[PDB]
Design a binder for this molecule. Structure first.
Ligand SMILES: c1cnc2c(c1)ccc1cccnc12
Length: 330
């Protein structure tokens, strides 16, 4: 089997991407944030604290004839950005663009943190990292990809995020018309539960490529590209007026600037992120200071190849016996 769904930016900055997901019987369609940096499929629901729901579409397990409460199971997640959510668990039918999983754990939110409530466009998350990170207790649950894997034509999923435009998540197949050239595959470590790989280096604009190992994760659930301080300082040094702002919380630059591109290495291959992809607009409404799309990972503890990097490539999340990541220009 295969599945194919369109993923859409939630706003004009591509802060996140939403993909419609069918849950239950009859189908309840929620727009979820497909996240390769986490492993919980959780949704806003009829059980979420009323004051914490503001515009989101909710999953009502009592209206699904296939929903079964998973006895004694609870979940609780805390994300890298400070957000959190928790609740109980049901098993139900979940479909993504024609691909169906029966008995998928659907984590129903009883509580969500302010940033989830404030984002009316995201009805929940669909985790695509390794099931070892799933927070369901006392019995850990599998991701949608893990549950579907055996049935897929090929044990893979691909991320093709668009820049200011719709894109696609495919399950079970590689669309050879969605990229140019060839896909370069690279080793993945699953030790931390992430799609963790090692970039071979970088270049800023038309500059000399620096060969240096950058260990990081391919994370569709993180907006920006988080890299070592030395790398990020080298990038922003090429932008007149750019500086690290402690008050804003990162590198900012004059909105009138034209940004240089950023290239990252995947083995001997190179992915070029166009400069416009690194512009995240005014730091505050009407400001002429803009927020950078490339930021230091010094405070995080891990480098993150978020949507800024991933949307410049056709990305293969290969769930073969030994998982690997594939990247191609597009
Ligand atoms: C991810 C993280 N931080 C940001 C954005 C996206 C977009 C704009 C912005 C403006 C000021 C500070 N942070 C951000």
């Amino acid at each position: 089997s295969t599945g194919s769904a369109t993923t859409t930016p939630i706003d004009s900055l591509d802060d996140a991407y939403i993909t419609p997901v069918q849950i239950g019987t009859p189908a309840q369609t929620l727009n979820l944030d497909f996240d390769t940096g986490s492993s919980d499929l959780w949704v806003f629901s009829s059980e979420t604290t009323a004051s914490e729901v503001d515009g989101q579409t909710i999953y009502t397990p009592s209206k699904s004839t296939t929903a079964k409460l998973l006895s004694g199971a609870t979940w609780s997640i805390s994300y890298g950005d400070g957000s959190s959510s928790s609740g109980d668990v049901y098993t139900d039918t979940v479909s993504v663009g024609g691909l169906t999983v029966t008995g998928q754990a659907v984590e129903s939110a009883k509580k969500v943190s302010s940033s989830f409530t404030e984002d009316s466009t995201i009805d929940g998350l669909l985790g695509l990292a390794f099931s070892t990170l799933n927070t369901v207790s006392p019995t850990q649950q599998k991701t949608f990809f893990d549950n579907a894997k055996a049935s897929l034509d090929s044990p893979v999923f691909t991320a093709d995020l668009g820049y200011h435009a719709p894109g696609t998540y495919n399950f079970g197949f590689i669309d050879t018309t969605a990229y140019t050239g060839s896909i370069t595959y690279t080793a993945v470590s699953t030790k931390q539960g992430f799609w963790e790989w090692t970039s071979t280096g970088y270049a800023v604009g038309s500059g000399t490529f620096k060969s240096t190992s950058i260990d990081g994760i391919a994370d569709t659930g993180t907006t920006l590209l988080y890299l070592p301080a030395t790398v990020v300082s080298a990038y922003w040094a090429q932008v007149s007026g750019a500086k690290s702002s402690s008050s804003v919380g990162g590198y900012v630059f004059p909105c009138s600037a034209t940004l240089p591109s950023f290239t990252f290495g995947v083995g001997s291959a190179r992915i070029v992120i166009p400069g416009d992809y690194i512009d995240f607009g005014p730091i505050s409404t009407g400001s002429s200071s803009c927020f950078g799309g490339i930021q230091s990972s010094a405070g995080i503890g891990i480098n993150i190849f978020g949507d800024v990097a991933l949307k410049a490539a056709f990305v293969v999340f290969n769930g073969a016996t030994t998982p690997t990541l594939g990247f191609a220009s597009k």
